[PDB]
Design a protein around this ligand. Structure first.
Ligand SMILES: CCCCCCCCCCCCCCCCCC(=O)O[C@H](COC(=O)CCCCCCCCC)COP(=O)(O)O
Ligand SMILES: *[C@@H]1O[C@H](CO)[C@@H](O[C@@H]2O[C@H](CO)[C@@H](O)[C@H](O)[C@H]2NC(C)=O)[C@H](O)[C@H]1NC(C)=O
Ligand SMILES: *[C@@H]1O[C@H](CO)[C@@H](O)[C@H](O)[C@H]1NC(C)=O
Lengths: 98, 272
């Protein structure tokens, strides 16, 4: 068992009202069974595309979830991951400044 | 450039299993093969490499026979020796070759068991690797008895991989050398210290992967620049961020400089 690391970042510079793509990169988890959700204001985004499960030279699993989004002044975006290595789901919120 | 066929297999019980695979040439995915799919899919227009349709079909047929035979073998290997914990079983296979300039290559076939590097193929046989549970010696001895399978793996590592991968490399050369320009943007987060600020330089959309990102005070490189990990984009371009810890007031005059092969010598210089 290995705990998943989560990173949330956008494809383009974020500008309020301008369509963009939100990325969620999940890595370092074992075994490969994982549930990844992308949320807008705590509610599950329906159109989320996932890459094919792959792994690194050191056998560390990695997956990239991405979605189309329009950043705003009032909306919160997050990536929630559920994995057996964790007692609770891990949610990491998009912070355009980090 | 490393050519690698990555297989992820999961055995939940004596009946239920799923095996999913993909093929990467460098950092570009060239093939896909999900459990329910009977045929391998191309994820690039150049994924057939320099193979003819008859040559590709023979390569695909071999994989089809192998996937059923692999599943059947692991199942047999588990049933013949109850290893106290029979299920769940997690297997990772990585096989291909590292491409070196001048038609030279080094082939490999590595296996992880329950997330840890367990077995390799060298010469004509499977060898348990340092750290793998010793009881794996028995299924490794059973597998090594099959000289026929061993000859195919030898064919695979000595002939199939170096020849298919060189052709793939040739047909994919222009894609692996395409230049995508990075776009940079800046932000800051207050640091865990009063009058301390973390400066963030975000760099996205560049291709190929080699890049240089540094926080500067004119000609002086700020040694405190910490490069994050390379993060993928869905379009297979790259993202990276470089941070700098500064004292409040010291931001003024600082710039983020990015050197990328796609810009010529015209570096991005973005002032705070
Ligand atoms: C008790 C624990 C379970 C044991 C775990 C031990 C770790 C695994 C040991 C190393 C992995 C070996 C991979 C298994 C290959 C067996 C494939 C096979 O059975 O060979 C051929 C068919 O396979 C081929 O066509 C050639 C194999 C080439 C594989 C290339 C594909 C890999 C890229 C995804 C038919 O033989 P049989 O009639 O005995 O079933
Ligand atoms: C594939 O290449 C390997 C070399 O990596 C060949 O391995 C030799 O095989 C013979 C037996 O056939 C052994 O006695 C040698 O010791 C092996 N050499 C090494 C360096 O281990 C292998 O035979 C080749 N197989 C085919 C079918 O081409
Ligand atoms: C994987 O595919 C094989 C062959 O089509 C099938 O027998 C098996 O049940 C599939 N497993 C899952 C979990 O889909």
């Amino acid at each position: 068992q290995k705990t998943p690391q989560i990173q949330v970042y956008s494809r383009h510079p974020p500008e309020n009202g301008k369509p963009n793509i939100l990325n969620c990169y999940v890595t370092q988890f074992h075994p490969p069974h994982i549930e990844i959700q992308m949320l807008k204001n705590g509610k599950k985004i329906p159109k989320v595309e996932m890459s094919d499960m792959s792994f690194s030279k050191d056998w560390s699993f990695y997956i990239l979830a991405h979605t189309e989004f329009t950043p705003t002044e009032t909306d919160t975006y997050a990536c929630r991951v559920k994995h057996a290595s964790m007692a609770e789901p891990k949610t990491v919120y998009w912070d355009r400044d980090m | 450039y490393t050519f690698r066929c990555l297989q992820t297999s999961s055995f939940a019980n004596i009946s239920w299993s799923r095996t999913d695979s993909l093929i990467l040439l460098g950092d570009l995915q060239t093939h896909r093969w999900s459990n329910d799919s009977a045929i391998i899919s191309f994820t690039k227009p150049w994924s057939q490499g320099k193979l003819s349709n008859q040559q590709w079909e023979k390569l695909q047929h071999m994989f089809q026979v192998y996937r059923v035979s692999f599943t059947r073998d692991i199942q047999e290997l588990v049933k013949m020796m109850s290893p106290k914990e029979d299920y769940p079983i997690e297997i990772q296979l990585s096989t291909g070759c590292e491409m070196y300039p001048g038609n030279a290559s080094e082939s490999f076939f590595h296996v992880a068991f329950q997330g840890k590097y367990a077995v390799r193929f060298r010469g004509t046989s499977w060898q348990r690797v340092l750290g793998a549970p010793s009881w794996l010696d028995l299924p490794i001895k059973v597998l090594n008895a099959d000289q026929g399978t061993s000859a195919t793996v030898q064919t695979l590592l000595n002939d199939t991989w170096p020849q298919f991968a060189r052709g793939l490399l040739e047909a994919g050369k222009s894609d692996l050398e395409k230049q995508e320009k990075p776009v940079a943007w800046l932000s800051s987060v207050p640091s865990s210290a009063h009058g301390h600020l973390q400066l963030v330089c975000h760099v996205s959309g560049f291709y190929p992967k080699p890049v240089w990102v540094m926080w500067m005070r004119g000609d002086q490189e700020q040694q405190g620049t910490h490069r994050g990990d390379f993060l993928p984009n869905a379009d297979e371009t790259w993202y990276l961020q470089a941070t700098l810890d500064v004292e409040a007031g010291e931001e003024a005059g600082l710039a983020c400089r990015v050197k990328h092969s796609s810009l010529g010598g015209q570096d991005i210089i973005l002032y705070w």
